[PDB]
Design a protein around this ligand. Structure first.
Ligand code: WUA
Lengths: 274, 104
C-alpha cells in the first residue's frame, strides 16, 4: 500500500526558511520530524516497526545530516541554479511491494528531477537548470549509492515491520453515519437533496439516491474528505423538480455493515408534510 | 505558476442544537504553501482551531484540514475564511445546515 516520506522546504528569502518532514502509509500519517530537538516522532505505537532505538538514533542523525546539508546546499548554488526567492522544493520517496520504489523532486510545484536506480536524472521538460542541479546532486557517487540502498533495501524492510505491526489498525471497520439536508444552490423550480455520510473506515463506500429499487443517475458524489479521527466524509447531491421529490431515499453500502445498508427517506419536515 | 485553493466545509455529525460536534474545513489544490485559514462563528474568528500537518497530492498541490470542536445553537452561523496569494480578497465558504421548516 506504499509507504513514503514527504519533504517540504520553503525558501522565502536568503535568510528565512521553513522545513517539514513526515512519513505516510498511503493516506495515513505515521511519522513526523521536529525541527526543534531534531527528533523523529512516532504518531502511533506501531510506527516503530520491530526496529530498535539504537537504529532510530542513526536514522535520525542521517535524516538530520541530509536535511541540514540540503539547506545550505540549495542556498549556496541558488544563483548558479537560477533559483529565485521565494520558492519551494518538494520531495517524495518510498516503495511499493507486490516490487517498486521512487524518489521524486519538484521545484515551484513542477517535476524537476528524480532518482533512477543509481543517480539523479533531470526531467527533460525541466530544462538546463535541472541538468545543472543533477550535476551538483551527483557530485558524490557514494551518497547516491546510499540513496539506492535506502529505497531498495531499507524501505521494503520497513514496510515489513510496519504493515504487520499496524494490521489491527488498518483492518478495522468503522460503520458510517448518514443524514439528509437541503442543498444550497438549486435552480429555479428545483430542489437539491443532500445525503451526508461520515465516520466510515476504510475508504471505499457506495452511496446513491434511489426511487425504491431504481438508482437515480443524477446522483452527484463529491470528494471523500478526511477527519482528524481518521475516518472519511462524503456528500451525494441530487437535483429534482420540486414536486417530484416523493419516494426518494438515500442508500449507503459499506464493508462494515455486513449487507445491512443504511436507508434514509426524504420525509417529515424535509418534504415538509402536513 | 500558482494554484488557487478549493475550500470545503463539513460537520462530523448531523447538526443538533446544544450537542457537541466538530466543524471541518478542507483546503486543497493550492500552491504555494503560504495560506491563512480561519473558522468563523457569527463572523468572529474562533480561537481554538487545530490543523493537520501540511501535505501534498501527486500533482504537488498542497492540502490541509482545519477543525474545531463546537456546540451549535439556532442563532449561530459558521464559516471558513481563507486568504492566499491567488485571492484578491479573503474567500468565505459557509457551513450549510438545515434549520427546519420556517412555518410553524
Ligand atoms: C525524503 C527525505 C529527503 C530530504 C532531503 C532530500 C532532498 C534532496 C535535494 C536537496 C539537496 C540540494 C543540495 C545538495 C546537497 C548535497 O546533496 C549534499 C552535499 O554533499 P556532501 O556531504 O558535501 O559530500 C562531500 C563529502 N565530503 C565530506 C568528503 C566532502 N549531500 C547530502 O548529504 C545531502 C543529500 C540530499 C539528497 C538525499 C536524498 C534523500 C533520500 C531519502 C529517501 C526517502 C525514502 C526512504 C524510506 C525509508 C525510511 C523509512 C523509515 C523512516 C521514517 C522517517 C519519517 C520522518
Amino acid at each position: 500500500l506504499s509507504f513514503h516520506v514527504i519533504w517540504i522546504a520553503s525558501f522565502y528569502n536568503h535568510s528565512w526558511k521553513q522545513n517539514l518532514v513526515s512519513g505516510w502509509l498511503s493516506d495515513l500519517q505515521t511519522h513526523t520530524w521536529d525541527s526543534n530537538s531534531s527528533t523523529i516522532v512516532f504518531l502511533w505505537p506501531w510506527s516503530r516497526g520491530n526496529f530498535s532505538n539504537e537504529e532510530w538514533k542513526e536514522l535520525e542523525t542521517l535524516f538530520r545530516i541530509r536535511t541540514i546539508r540540503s539547506f545550505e546546499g540549495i542556498r549556496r548554488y541558488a544563483h548558479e541554479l537560477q533559483f529565485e526567492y521565494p520558492f519551494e522544493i518538494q520531495v517524495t520517496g518510498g516503495c511499493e511491494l507486490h516490487s517498486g520504489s521512487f524518489l521524486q523532486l519538484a521545484y515551484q510545484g513542477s517535476d524537476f528531477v528524480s532518482f533512477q536506480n543509481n543517480s539523479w536524472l533531470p526531467y527533460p521538460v525541466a530544462g538546463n537548470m535541472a541538468k545543472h542541479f543533477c550535476k551538483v546532486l551527483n557530485q558524490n557517487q557514494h551518497e547516491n549509492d546510499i540513496t539506492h540502498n535506502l529505497l531498495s533495501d531499507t524501505c521494503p524492510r520497513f514496510i515489513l515491520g510496519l504493515l504487520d505491526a499496524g494490521k489491527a489498525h488498518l483492518q478495522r471497520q468503522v460503520k458510517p453515519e448518514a443524514w439528509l439536508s437541503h442543498g444550497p444552490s438549486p435552480g429555479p423550480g428545483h430542489l437539491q437533496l443532500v445525503c451526508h455520510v461520515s465516520g466510515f473506515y476504510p475508504k471505499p463506500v457506495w452511496v446513491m439516491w434511489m426511487r425504491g429499487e431504481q438508482e437515480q443517475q443524477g446522483t452527484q458524489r463529491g470528494d471523500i474528505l478526511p477527519s482528524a479521527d481518521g475516518t472519511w466524509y462524503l456528500r451525494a447531491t441530487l437535483e429534482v423538480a420540486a414536486g417530484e421529490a416523493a419516494d426518494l431515499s438515500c442508500r449507503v453500502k459499506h464493508s462494515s455493515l455486513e449487507g445491512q445498508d443504511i436507508v434514509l427517506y426524504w420525509e417529515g419536515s424535509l418534504v415538509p408534510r402536513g | 505558476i500558482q494554484r488557487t485553493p478549493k475550500i470545503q466545509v463539513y460537520s462530523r455529525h448531523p447538526a443538533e442544537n446544544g450537542k457537541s460536534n466538530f466543524l471541518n474545513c478542507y483546503v486543497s489544490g493550492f500552491h504555494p504553501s503560504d495560506i491563512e485559514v480561519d473558522l468563523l462563528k457569527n463572523g468572529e474568528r474562533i480561537e481554538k482551531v487545530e490543523h493537520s500537518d501540511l501535505s501534498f497530492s501527486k500533482d504537488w498541490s498542497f492540502y490541509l484540514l482545519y477543525y474545531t470542536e463546537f456546540t451549535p445553537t439556532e442563532k449561530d452561523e459558521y464559516a471558513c475564511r481563507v486568504n492566499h496569494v491567488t485571492l484578491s480578497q479573503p474567500k468565505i465558504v459557509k457551513w450549510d445546515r438545515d434549520m427546519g421548516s420556517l412555518v410553524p
